[PDB]
Design a protein around this ligand. Structure first.
Ligand code: MG
Ligand code: ZN
Lengths: 1340, 79, 286, 301
């Protein structure tokens, strides 16, 4: 194993040999945004796609144009951390090259009139960290992938809209990437109709006229031919046999001389078959059969030139006469099978009043621009703009793909613009589905739903900015001068950066990151939603989208989605998933060939999956043969079933890919219900890190890669030897081979100490290593807030036993010991931030100074010179942090205090206090202060003491850096002289600088002397430039608001501990609030006196079925026991060999354990440290659905010399006796939560009041009154407490006379009530009277 | 108004030249007038922000609900 | 294994083509339900009296000491269906369609669910849970309209001096009693004199609270029909009388005048509802 | 109004009034000038438009907006819907003298009791304390009083316990479906920030200790206090008005203890001797000599 694995191994009972190892988890953010930047020449992605798709642009007249060239980005001015500290966006410059080519409208296109090829900055752009956040005003923020109906086309059918009909109505819809929608539909009367974007209904055929088709060409396209021949008097006609199918003979249908079908007889498939086999196509028939048939195409007499029948008109017998007399012994007609080939289009034509292309354009123009006097090109241009202009309609070649496949083309690609072939093919497949062939499609299938990551949205808003530019570009091109108006004398970068900024800071997807837990971060990045733009709404959407669809398998976790109104909408991504290039999804599958499971992989998409047949990972493979058992669990078609062995196409990879990470971590999930796992994995994200990092024993194996891939830890970039160690930084020297030749290869890592999280928690780092040891590359060099040796640790493992206790664990509540509290182990941190702003007023500036009137030296004892707190303080409500004061106005006084300062002579200044203080209820420890000030105002002294010290710190931190880096170099400057003789001790003893004068020679060594001269020169010089830019970055003032003169900021530390009310839980939904802490003596305990830490009520196990905690508990009791054995082996201090035997005997225990590890490979001290790190408990991996078994649990517990049932006689402590029976016992891994009473509790006597209604507020942050809803009125209406009601209606809320009067009657003792009138009432009267109404009262 | 026009028009060109925005130091220089008037106008250019905006991203808190009234009295002061 | 062989038989019959799919469908699903019932029998017989415990004699068995079963029989937590989900196969499962899947569950939580078994539990759990989120809208809406109607109503009088009203007779239909006339009369006030099958034996002078002693008294008599001065039938303009409404249940006595009924009603009716969306004729006895 | 940083904030009506007055005044101008009737017409369509918008914006046609693109709340919206006065601010009111917190169990309690945080009640019952310290005169005035209550002296607590006695208090959990969702208990002071509760009345609350939070109100005036002790009191209410069933049904732990205790095995011991009563049976089991579950002869009365 690896080094960070050698020291603390996690056992495994997984058996399924994994072919694959997990991927990098945060790949999608990186790759998406990368495509948004990455300089694609041809297969345009994001930026270049927007420039190409928009530029070039030419004038409003047609003479001048701007031309795209290329782009380039600057490195950002500010690094990451100054952007965190300052409250500043992290972002990089943008620079586009632009060429103003202009054309003479004198010359035809004599382009050489003007060229201005210059460069333009416009707009910053935020960038992505190595981990995925975007820093914005000093806030780490995350922006979330979206999921929505892909572009293309989508067919549907509502069942009984007119429920009186009880009838089916089919419809089709076209939905592009950009541009307008399009709806096709049927009616009860079987008439095709159109509406655009849901404008009004229109007879569909109108559009086809507008598309320059005649009724002839239309019916040629839609209707197949039925050809008659009037052979000299009588009617014969051509007939394919499968035309009279399920059809009934109207006449005696006979043949050459032969009767197939009689009158009143069905043309059975027998007679279709005789009509087929007999080579019979022509049949003699009655003329009367025609009458009712419709002509297909216009017929005249070549003598007349007159329509004997216009096209699409019903035939007769006088028209059979007159046609054949006019020279028609051929009459093509329209096939019409009301069953299969319906008269939809023709009826729609007979309803359609429009005859020409033009009027069709007019009535479209009238649908969308109602009223307006129509004109030709307004309407032609309108229609052609809608779906035939590149500007206002683009499909996304994605959309072109899906569309084409929906029409069964071969062409993936095409245009973002429609063609008439496309429209009419859609109408054809529509009516085809109206006949019965094919099917409507479904929403909930993933193959209709497309992911939209960051870079695509950024592309969108970027282009919108380009339009905001483009209007004024043209207005300023055609009008203003050409040769002199530079390209950037037109450009304004404000709409662009305003757009990018707007999206990064106002959209629903843009939001603060959940920093309470690395798990919560990574899963907040692996989030997927259908809301936001191009999406849905809670009040609108229903259950269908919320529910699962079987294609979620291997792509979306069904186990992680909230319990509130967002139950189905939000959902998280699965583990081995990826994205289709188009935006759809895919998932790995092992290909199954000849029964042999092929170890290659293919990423089947949302749609390929159902067509093949797919097997499970549960399959007990026949050892590189095939599936052992005949009836193999496989699936296809959107359902599972049992199939054969050689018959298979594909297999799942692992036993996991259905899941997300969170539910990949809950062990013994297979022994649990989905509801309580939902709640477990949800609350698994709301954890808080403990003060320490206590690992879990019951594992899954994914813990490590999550502890790494959050990026929170240090990572060995290039493995090597630990050079320097500290509590704040680490230095490693890089291995020689890994050391690139140019660079010295000495990596250094600066670590983060106690620092605020966005949820006000402790962020911190610590080395998981010693000094002077090799490092395998990729190891963890530093742990974080919730990690240990490279594994996650959200909480702490401890002793548990299931029984009631005197009512203290009544309904899921918890009882807990004192011993836990003495070990601080659930104690946690809540760093906080507080600020004070120095403003400029109408009267003068606010001033930060120690001096404040009417203050005692008690408070002031801790403010330094400038009126600022010394670091190290420990403070409480009422204390003062920053003495700020404000020049004051003046006062209209009362006679009394006037007399009182006429007595004492005391006075005010012309100034008021505005200090920064602790808010009531709070206490804690000041540990850091920061100050920001304008470039232009004096730095208040302490600021100089801060920034100068920030240079003492900084320039030291760099001196060290350069001193080490350069000191290594200073070997060269020693040795290089020494090549070319030797000064064996004349070199060393005399001072090191003066060796250049020692042993010297000609040809090659003078260049050497001056090479060292260069080295010296460089080495000081780089320092000086470093120092220059660095020091000015420290000293340069701050970009603040107007009126804001300087700011202070104060960071605290508060150390909150467990109390009744502080919720806790585990990883199965096994919630619980605390009701008491129990002394060690009143606890239950055992024969050996080791008491319990936590007690639980198993009433709530069976009905909740969260059974894994039981098995987990058993296993925990096992693991600790082994550690206890080893602990006995250490204090008794046995020997190497006994540890060797015992440990290797412990690893090789399970039935068919996948992993096999030997210890003779390891050396002695490895055995030592590993036995020493296991003594608290041997940690184990229970993969989620490849779990362990009762045989293995109980085998292990027998190795522990414990009761196999894990269930022991307990003795009560208060009474000293035994209980009746045994009780289950063992170790749960358990957690604390942010839902702490310290942050929830709130009271209110009397305080603030609002502004319009004057009734109090809500929220503890605003000293809020609690709401008394209508329900809570209806109750008192039930009882009859009119007085309690009136009390809550007048004095506590609105009646100001009442509240003041009441306070005064109280302090006089009197508990007496007077009412007034609520102000919101008379407010309402005033409003109504504003609405033009004489509302008024009938005074008594 | 005219001063604001000149300001926001010049700031664009200064943005081209610098590649960055101008400071009231550099801009008071370019604007020919001293920093006091610049800073003054910058303090004047702000609009109101519409009490009925949802500062609760959910339809929970229209900003007017948040506002306190510090005008009337407090009953303890009266007593 | 048995039922597996059965569906193999019905399978090969469908392969012959004798049987349809719908017939086949209802057939196989029905045998599955049967097998489930049988495992329920086997387990319940294998827990409740599984304990054989001797005492001064050879053997004898009694109600068990299995703590899970004691939790079941108490009524504290659990029930035979749930315990079945722990020990036995857990039913069949409807996919989101409203259909009912063909191949049911075999294993349990103690043994271990399969991948797909869990993946299929998903649909039902998320579905009914989505309903849990999304039925209180209708509940609070309905309740709000009910309270809205029933605001104004309060008892205005002690006795309206009014006349007969509604008849109370039991709701025995379909089987045996579902609301005894005991319960229906309970706390109500008579329309008029009332007598016994031994006839012309009055007990009410047209209005009395018919507490449990009256109700037992008329359980003795074989009466099955009563009349009552109803809340509806009362004539009091702008309210009702105390008698016609009868007993304030939570007091155990006649309602005091001035108490507000309508809110009690709408609360009383809407409060429960949130949970609570969620050939021949053959004489039985003589 | 302003905010801290010089920013202002307004109600959407003022925009509408401005549009109206601009339009009327321009109209008056155009009427001084005998200008063409067409612009008169247009200005008046603009007028009736803006008035109609003031009375309801998104009614007559497509909606009017400020710069946000979300519409301008007219007058009537302030009278209408949830956000109107009625449902939000008039039938429902924020409250003085109230609070809330997490809840946990009080197993030892009696029915009339509520575990109560000190500090929460200290705040809620302040002016009583002040009246009683002006009474005793420890704080001659209210500046002294407030400073003492901030200093949290010893008599603070003794006087807190002095006033709180016989002073009931209301409890409320959401959603307040039926009248038993809100009840009047007596206070009991405890050294913690979490309410305790009498478990049997969790059922009327449909409540569990899975992180739930409850709210507290105070009957200031005497009449509400007596109504609380007499109507909202936990003793007066053990039955629903829907049905006369006990709503004091022992839930899930107590019931197990009963069903375990009252049970008739065969097997343990002590079968078929005789007792003079329950008490020496208690001597047996508190000694641990009998089965707790075993049919045996006794005498009773
Ligand atoms: Mg709850
Ligand atoms: Zn009546």
């Amino acid at each position: 194993y690896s080094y960070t694995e050698k020291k603390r191994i996690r056992k495994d009972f997984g058996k399924r040999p994994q072919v694959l190892d997990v991927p990098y988890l945060l790949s999608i953010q990186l790759d998406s945004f990368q495509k948004f930047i990455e300089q694609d020449p041809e297969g345009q992605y994001g930026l270049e796609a927007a420039f190409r798709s928009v530029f070039p642009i030419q004038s409003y007249s047609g003479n001048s144009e701007l031309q795209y060239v290329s782009y380039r980005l600057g490195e950002p001015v500010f690094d990451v951390q100054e952007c965190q500290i300052r409250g500043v966006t992290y972002s990089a410059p943008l620079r586009v090259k632009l060429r103003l080519v202009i054309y003479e409208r004198e010359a035809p296109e004599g382009t050489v009139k003007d060229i201005k090829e210059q460069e333009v900055y416009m707009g910053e752009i935020p960038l992505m960290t190595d981990n995925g956040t975007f820093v914005i005003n000093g806030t780490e923020r995350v922006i979330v992938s979206q999921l929505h109906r892909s572009p293309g086309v989508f067919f549907d059918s509502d069942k009984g809209k007119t429920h009186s009909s009880g009838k089916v109505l089919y419809n089709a819809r076209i939905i592009p990437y950009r541009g307008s929608w399009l709806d096709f539909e049927f009616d009860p009367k079987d008439n095709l109709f159109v509406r655009i974007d849901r404008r009004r209904k229109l007879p569909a055929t109108i559009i086809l006229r507008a598309l320059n088709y005649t009724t002839e060409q239309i019916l040629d396209l839609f209707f197949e031919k039925v050809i008659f021949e009037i052979r000299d008097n009588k009617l014969q006609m051509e007939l394919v046999p499968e035309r009279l199918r399920g059809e009934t003979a109207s006449f005696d249908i006979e043949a050459n001389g032969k009767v197939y079908v009689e009158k009143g007889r069905r043309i059975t498939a027998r007679h279709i078959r005789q009509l087929e086999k007999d080579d019979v196509k022509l049949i003699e028939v009655p003329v009367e059969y025609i009458a009712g048939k419709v002509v297909a195409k216009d017929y005249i007499d070549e003598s007349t030139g007159e329509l004997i029948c216009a096209a699409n008109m019903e035939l007769s017998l006088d028209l059979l006469a007159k046609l054949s007399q006019s020279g028609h012994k051929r009459i093509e007609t329209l096939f019409t099978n009301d069953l299969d080939h319906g008269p939809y289009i023709s009826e729609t034509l007979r309803v359609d009043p429009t005859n020409d292309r033009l009027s069709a354009l007019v009535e479209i123009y009238r649908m969308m621009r109602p009223g307006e006097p129509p004109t030709r090109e307004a309407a032609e241009s309108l229609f052609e703009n809608l779906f035939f202009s590149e500007d206002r309609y683009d499909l996304s070649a994605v959309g072109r793909m899906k569309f084409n496949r929906s029409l069964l083309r071969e062409e993936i690609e095409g245009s973002g613009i429609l063609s008439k072939d496309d429209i009419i093919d859609v109408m054809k497949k529509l009516i085809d589905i109206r006949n019965g062939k094919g099917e409507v499609d479904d929403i909930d299938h993933l193959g209709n739903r497309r992911i939209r990551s960051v870079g695509e949205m950024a592309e969108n808003q970027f282009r919108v900015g380009l339009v905001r530019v483009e209007r004024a570009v043209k207005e300023r091109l055609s009008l203003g001068d050409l040769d002199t108006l530079m390209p950037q004398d037109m450009i304004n970068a404000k709409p662009i950066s305003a757009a990018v900024k707007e999206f990064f800071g106002s959209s629903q997807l843009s939001q603060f990151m959940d920093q309470n837990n690395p798990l919560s971060e990574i899963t907040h990045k692996r989030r997927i939603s259908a809301l936001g733009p191009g999406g849905l709404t809670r009040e609108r959407a229903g259950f269908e989208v919320r529910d699962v669809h079987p294609t979620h398998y291997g792509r979306v976790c069904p186990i992680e989605t909230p319990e509130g109104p967002n139950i189905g909408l939000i959902n998280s991504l699965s583990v081995y998933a990826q994205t289709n290039e188009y935006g759809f999804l895919e998932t790995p599958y092992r290909k199954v060939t000849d029964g042999v499971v092929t170890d290659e992989i293919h990423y089947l998409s949302a749609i390929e999956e159902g067509n093949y047949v797919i097997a499970q990972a549960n399959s007990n493979l026949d050892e590189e043969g095939h599936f052992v058992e005949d009836l193999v669990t496989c699936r296809s078609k959107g359902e599972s079933s049992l199939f054969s062995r050689d018959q298979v196409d594909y297999m799942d990879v692992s036993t996991q890919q259905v899941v997300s990470v969170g539910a990949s971590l809950i062990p013994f999930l297979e022994h649990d219900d989905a509801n309580r796992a939902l709640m477990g994995a949800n609350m698994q994200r709301q954890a808080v890190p403990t003060l320490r990092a206590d690992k879990p024993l019951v594992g899954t194996g994914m813990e490590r890669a999550v502890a790494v891939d959050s990026g929170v830890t240090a990572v060995a970039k290039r493995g090597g030897v630990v050079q320097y160690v500290d509590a704040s930084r680490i230095v490693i020297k890089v291995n020689e081979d890994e050391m690139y030749p140019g660079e010295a290869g000495i990596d250094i890592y600066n670590l983060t100490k106690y620092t605020r999280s966005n949820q006000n928690t402790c962020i911190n780092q610590m080395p998981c290593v010693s000094l002077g040891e090799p490092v395998e590359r990729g190891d963890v060099l530093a742990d974080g807030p919730s990690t240990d040796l490279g594994e996650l640790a959200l909480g702490q493992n401890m002793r548990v036993a299931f029984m009631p206790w005197n009512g203290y664990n009544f309904e899921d509540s918890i009882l807990v010991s004192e011993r836990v509290v003495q070990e601080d182990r659930f104690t946690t941190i809540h760093i906080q931030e507080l600020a004070c702003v120095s403003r400029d007023t109408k009267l003068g500036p606010e001033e930060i100074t120690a001096d404040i009137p009417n203050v005692g030296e008690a408070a002031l004892s801790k403010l330094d010179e400038s009126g600022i707190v010394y670091i190290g303080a420990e403070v409480t409500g009422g204390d003062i942090l920053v003495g700020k004061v404000t020049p004051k106005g003046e006062t209209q006084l009362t006679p009394e205090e006037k007399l009182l300062r006429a007595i004492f002579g005391e006075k005010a200044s012309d100034v008021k206090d505005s200090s920064l203080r602790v808010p009531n209820g709070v206490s804690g420890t000041v540990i850091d202060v920061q100050v920001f000030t304008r470039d232009g105002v004096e730095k208040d002294k302490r600021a100089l003491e801060i920034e100068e010290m920030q240079l003492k710190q900084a320039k030291k931190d760099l001196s060290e850096e350069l001193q080490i880096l350069e000191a290594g170099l200073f070997s060269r400057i020693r040795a290089v002289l020494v090549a070319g003789g030797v000064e064996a001790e004349k070199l060393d003893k005399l001072p090191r600088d003066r060796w250049l004068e020692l042993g010297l020679t000609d040809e090659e060594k003078q260049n050497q002397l001056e090479q060292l001269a260069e080295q010296y020169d460089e080495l000081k010089h780089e320092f000086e430039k470093k120092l220059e830019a660095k020091r000015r970055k420290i000293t340069q003032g701050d970009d603040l608001a107007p009126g804001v003169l300087k700011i202070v900021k104060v960071y605290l530390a508060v150390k909150r501990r467990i109390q009744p009310g502080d919720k806790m839980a585990g990883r199965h939904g096994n919630k619980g609030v605390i009701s008491k802490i129990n002394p060690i003596e009143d606890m239950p305990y055992d024969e050996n006196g080791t008491p319990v830490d936590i007690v639980l009520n198993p009433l709530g196990v069976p009905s909740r079925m969260n059974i894994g905690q039981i098995l987990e508990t058993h296993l925990g009791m096992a693991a600790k026991g082994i550690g206890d054995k080893i602990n006995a082996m250490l204090k008794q201090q046995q020997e190497v060999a006994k540890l060797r035997e015992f440990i290797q005997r412990a690893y090789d225990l399970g039935a068919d354990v996948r992993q096999k590890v030997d210890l003779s490979t390891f050396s002695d001290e490895e055995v030592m440290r590993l036995a020493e790190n296991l003594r608290k408990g041997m940690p184990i991996a229970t993969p989620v659905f490849d779990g362990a078994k009762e045989a293995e649990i109980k085998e292990l517990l027998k190795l522990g010399d414990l009761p196999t049932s894990g269930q022991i006689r307990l003795y009560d402590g208060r009474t000293g006796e035994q209980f009746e029976r045994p009780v289950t016992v063992g170790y749960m891994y358990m957690l604390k939560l942010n839902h702490l009473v310290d942050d929830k509790m709130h009271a209110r006597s009397t305080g603030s009041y609002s502004l319009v209604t004057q009734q109090p507020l809500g929220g503890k942050a605003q000293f809020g009154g609690q709401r008394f809803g209508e329900m809570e009125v209806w109750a008192l209406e039930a009882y009859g407490a009119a007085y309690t009601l009136q009390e809550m209606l007048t004095v506590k809320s609105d009646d100001v006379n009442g509240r003041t009067k009441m306070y005064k009657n109280i302090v006089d003792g009197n508990h007496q009530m007077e009412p007034g009138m609520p102000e919101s009432f008379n407010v309402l009267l005033k409003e109504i009277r504003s609405l033009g109404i004489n509302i008024e009262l009938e005074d008594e | 108004i005219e001063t604001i026009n000149k300001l926001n028009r010049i700031s664009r060109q200064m943005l081209q030249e610098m590649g960055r925005e101008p400071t009231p130091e550099e801009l008071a220089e370019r604007m020919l007038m001293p920093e006091d008037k610049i800073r003054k106008v910058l303090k004047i250019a702000k609009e109101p922000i519409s009490m009925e905006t949802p500062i609760g991203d959910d339809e929970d808190s229209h900003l007017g609900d948040f506002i306190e009234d510090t005008t009337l009295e407090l009953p303890l002061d009266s007593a | 294994s048995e039922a597996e062989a059965e569906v193999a038989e019905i399978q090969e019959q469908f392969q012959s083509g004798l049987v349809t799919a719908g017939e086949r469908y209802n057939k196989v699903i029905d045998i599955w339900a049967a097998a489930n019932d049988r495992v329920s029998k086997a387990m319940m017989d294998n827990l409740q009296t599984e304990t054989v415990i001797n005492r001064d004699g050879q053997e004898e068995k009694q109600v068990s000491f299995n703590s899970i079963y004691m939790m079941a029989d108490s009524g504290a937590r659990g029930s035979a269906a749930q315990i079945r989900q722990l020990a036995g196969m857990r039913g069949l499962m409807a996919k989101p369609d409203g259909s009912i899947i063909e191949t049911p569950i075999t294993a349990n939580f103690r043994e271990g669910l399969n991948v797909l078994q869990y993946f299929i539990s998903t649909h039902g759990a998320r579905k009914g849970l989505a309903d849990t989120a999304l039925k209180t809208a209708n509940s609070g809406y309905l309740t709000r309209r009910l309270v809205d109607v029933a605001q104004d109503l309060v008892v205005t009088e002690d006795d309206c001096g009014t006349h007969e009203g509604i008849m109370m007779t039991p709701v025995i239909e379909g089987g045996d009693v579902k609301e005894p006339l005991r319960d229906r009369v309970l706390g109500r006030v008579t329309a008029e004199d009332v007598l016994k099958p031994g006839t012309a034996d009055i007990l009410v002078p047209r209005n009395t609270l018919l507490h449990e002693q009256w109700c037992d008294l008329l359980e003795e008599n074989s009466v099955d029909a009563v009349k009552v001065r109803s809340v509806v039938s009362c004539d009091t303009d702008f309210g009702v009388c105390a008698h016609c409404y009868g007993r304030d249940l939570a007091r155990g006595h006649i309602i005091n005048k001035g108490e507000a009924i309508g809110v009690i009603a709408a609360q009383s009716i809407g409060e429960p509802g949130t949970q609570l969306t969620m050939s021949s004729i053959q004489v039985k006895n003589k | 109004v302003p905010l801290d940083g010089g920013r202002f904030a307004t109600s959407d009506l003022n925009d509408l009034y401005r549009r109206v007055i601009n339009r009327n005044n321009r109209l008056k101008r155009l009427l001084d000038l005998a200008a063409p009737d067409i612009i008169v017409r247009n200005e008046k369509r603009m007028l009736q438009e803006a008035v109609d918008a003031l009375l309801d914006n998104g009614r007559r046609g497509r909606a009017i907006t400020g710069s946000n693109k979300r519409p301008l709340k007219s007058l009537a919206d302030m009278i209408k819907g949830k956000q109107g006065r009625f449902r939000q601010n008039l039938l429902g009111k924020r409250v003085d003298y109230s609070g809330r917190s997490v809840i946990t169990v009080g197993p030892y309690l009696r029915l009339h009791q509520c575990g109560l945080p000190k500090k929460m009640a200290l705040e809620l019952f302040k002016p009583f304390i002040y009246g009683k310290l002006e009474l005793r005169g420890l704080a001659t005035t209210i500046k002294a009083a407030k400073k003492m209550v901030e200093r949290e002296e010893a008599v603070v607590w003794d006087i807190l316990d002095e006033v709180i006695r016989e002073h009931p208090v209301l409890l409320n959990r959401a959603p307040t479906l039926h009248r038993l969702g809100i009840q009047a208990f007596e206070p009991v002071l405890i050294e913690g920030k979490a309410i305790q509760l009498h478990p049997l009345v969790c059922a009327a609350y449909n409540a569990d200790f899975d992180g739930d939070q409850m709210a507290v109100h105070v009957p200031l005036t005497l009449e509400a206090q007596l109504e609380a002790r007499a109507l909202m009191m936990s003793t007066n209410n053990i039955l629903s008005p829907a049905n006369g069933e006990p709503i004091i049904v022992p839930s899930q732990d107590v019931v197990l203890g009963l069903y375990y205790m009252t049970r008739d095995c065969v097997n343990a011991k002590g079968e078929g001797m005789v007792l003079t009563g329950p008490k020496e049976a208690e001597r047996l089991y508190r000694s641990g000599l009998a089965s707790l579950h075993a049919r045996v002869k006794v005498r009773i009365t």
